[PDB]
Design a protein around this nucleic acid. Structure first.
Lengths: 98, 153, 127, 97, 179
RNA sequence: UUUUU
């Protein structure tokens, strides 16, 4: 379980929700053991829940928080057409619009 | 000179203007419906209240106003109009009762007794005069991805 | 090389006429109305009806030899409305698009100096 | 050899885009998918191509820049398969241990 | 695309607004429609012509003339531009006396009823019916789609015949929901 | 919860 900050763009309301971590995040937690010796990871959820409910990777940072600072910086680069910028994962149009 | 022509035009606009208020003022003058005049009065009192056009009354001003009201007692039911409506059952109706109560409330108003606006000009003059591009745009570039008034136009 | 006719457009409330005649006005070249191009009597005054009527006369006139028309648009006039309706406006636009050269456009609505009484009555009409 | 926050490179890019001071740039912990890291990889993909072109034009005046993306559990398609980032898919090296 | 011309006489009370809006009038006419625009100050009539070598759309000239005409009747520029943008907009025009022979204060009150206080009633009709209305003295012009202008006309006519604005307003909500 | 020039 992880407490993530979810930003509702429609109403600008910020919420903190406790939800399932991603599979990679869980794999990273299991990796904390095994750095100094053979170790064990005891997960408090069943494998059935893990395979079905856990997302493979958590959503990228860009798709979860405001981008007004980034747009200003890129506009100071004379990057007028942010839409055609080669992003790894482009930000949502609505977030860009606001 | 031709400046004289400019003077006539300026007068002509001012005359055309004065007529427009006269026509509008003439028409609003004829309408004397209670509902229409009531709506206009209410909206005016809001605007004056919201903009605070009216100056605050000093304590001495209130005392003088209260003195006249006590001297006269002009806002009680002994007046000719109030006595006429009351004694003849015309105040049982809602509308004329409101006017009587409006008069009475207005009279009541006058009877009442470590250590731990200037509008901001955000114009370009009030500015932090800090000092720090075309080639950087060339770096961007490398990335890639009244006419017709009087003559034919 | 350029022959002129006259295209008379009568834009009433419940129908639109497009009548093309020679310069004098005695000889009719083609008369088509909104009713002849629509199935329901409600849509006879519709702009769509006028467009079909205008296109039909435009095609017919080209066959005859007429290559340009002077537009004389009119309303019912008289004691009724004096400005042509959208049916007339639509007919004018279709005629322009047809390629038929538009010479001169004038409004010839019958306007009375002063007329008889209007059919409405004292209380009015057209609820 | 200089260790620094992503924002430091972002600002140094604000002031000099070609990063003439640097011979190679390492973006570590890219699996974190930080917004700043995403912006830097997007900008650096463009920078490195620029510097390679300039080196091809004038090796003496202009030199190449080598780019390394370092991560643990990367979704390699995010950076290898994204042709908008890199028109030619970069090689991927896996440390098997 | 033969050489053709249109002339649209500007009434004097619309000349000054035509001046202030000329900068935004000739660009769309000369660029999109490829029309040759000009105003004859001697005749005070806007002149439009088809350029045979450049103009390509046969309906550009008539489309432009209607756009000038709409501004001439009293419609704002942007609303007139809708005639250039679209092809299914028409102008309905009728007089108060056509509906009912009103004179004196009766005519003044009829115009006031249509406009409403602060123009609210006119805007109410315009929004509900998706049309634009210009109330020039006793002369009423309505701009919009053919089915739309008829709906606005009926709401206007009911006001002329004496129907109070309040009842007409409720009827606008009903038709607006149907739309 | 994180976290940044």
């Amino acid at each position: 379980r992880s407490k993530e900050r979810k930003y509702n763009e429609s109403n600008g309301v910020q919420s903190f929700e406790v939800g399932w971590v991603s599979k990679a995040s869980a794999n990273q937690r299991s990796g904390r053991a095994g750095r100094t010796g053979p170790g064990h990871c005891y997960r408090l959820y069943s494998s059935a829940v893990f395979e079905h409910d856990f997302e493979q990777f958590s959503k990228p940072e860009i798709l979860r928080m405001p981008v007004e600072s980034i747009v200003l910086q890129m506009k100071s680069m004379a990057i007028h057409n942010i839409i055609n910028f080669p992003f790894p994962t482009p930000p949502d149009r609505v977030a860009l619009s606001k | 000179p031709e400046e004289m022509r400019k003077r006539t035009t300026e007068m002509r606009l001012m005359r055309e203007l004065m007529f427009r208020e006269e026509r509008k003022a003439r028409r609003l003058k004829k309408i004397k419906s209670k509902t229409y005049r009531k709506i206009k009065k209410k909206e005016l009192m809001k605007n004056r209240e919201l903009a605070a056009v009216s100056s605050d009354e000093d304590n001495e001003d209130h005392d003088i106003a209260r003195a006249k009201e006590r001297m006269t007692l002009k806002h009680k039911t002994n007046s000719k109009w109030a006595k006429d409506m009351i004694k003849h059952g015309m105040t049982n109706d809602a509308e004329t009762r409101e006017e009587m109560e409006e008069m009475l409330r207005q009279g009541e108003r006058l009877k009442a007794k470590n250590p731990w606006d200037l509008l901001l000009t955000a114009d370009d003059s009030t500015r932090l005069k800090i000092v720090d591009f075309k080639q950087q745009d060339v770096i961007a570039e490398a990335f890639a991805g009244l006419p017709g008034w009087g003559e034919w136009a | 090389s350029q022959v002129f006719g006259v295209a008379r457009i009568y834009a009433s409330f419940n129908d639109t006429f497009v009548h093309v005649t020679d310069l004098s006005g005695k000889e009719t070249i083609a008369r088509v109305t909104g009713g002849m191009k629509v199935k329901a009597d409600r849509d006879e005054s519709s702009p769509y009806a006028a467009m079909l009527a205008a296109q039909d006369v435009a095609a017919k006139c080209k066959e005859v030899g007429i290559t340009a028309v002077h537009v004389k648009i009119r309303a019912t006039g008289g004691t009724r409305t004096k400005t042509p309706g959208p049916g007339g406006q639509a007919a004018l636009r279709a005629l322009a698009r047809s390629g038929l050269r538009i010479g001169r456009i004038e409004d010839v609505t019958p306007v009375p100096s002063d007329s008889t009484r209007k059919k409405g009555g004292r209380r009015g009409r057209r609820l | 050899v200089k260790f620094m926050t992503d924002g430091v490179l972002l600002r140094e890019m604000m002031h000099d885009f070609k990063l003439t001071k640097y011979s190679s740039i390492i973006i570590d912990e890219a699996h974190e998918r930080n917004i700043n890291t995403d912006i830097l990889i997007g900008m650096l993909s463009r920078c490195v191509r620029l510097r390679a072109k300039l080196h091809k034009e004038n090796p003496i005046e202009h030199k190449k820049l080598k780019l390394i993306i370092m991560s643990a559990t990367l979704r390699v398609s995010d950076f290898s398969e994204n042709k908008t980032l890199f028109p030619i898919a970069p090689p991927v090296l896996q440390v098997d241990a | 695309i033969k050489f053709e011309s249109r002339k649209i006489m500007v009434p004097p009370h619309r000349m000054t607004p035509l001046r202030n809006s000329w900068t935004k009038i000739y660009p769309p006419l000369v660029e999109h429609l490829k029309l040759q625009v000009r105003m004859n100050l001697k005749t005070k009539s806007v002149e439009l012509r088809t350029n045979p070598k450049f103009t390509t759309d046969p309906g550009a000239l008539q489309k432009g003339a209607d756009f000038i005409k709409a501004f001439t009747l009293g419609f704002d520029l942007d609303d007139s531009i809708a005639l250039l943008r679209l092809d299914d907009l028409y102008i309905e025009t009728f007089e108060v006396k056509d509906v009912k022979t009103l004179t004196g204060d009766h005519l003044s009150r009829a115009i006031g009823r249509i406009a409403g206080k602060d123009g609210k009633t006119k805007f109410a009709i315009e929004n509900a019916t998706r049309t634009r209305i210009v109330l020039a003295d006793s002369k009423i012009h309505i701009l919009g789609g053919f089915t739309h202008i008829r709906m606005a006309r009926e709401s206007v006519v009911s006001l002329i015949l004496g129907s109070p604005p309040g009842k007409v307003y409720g009827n606008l909500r009903t038709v607006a929901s149907r739309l």
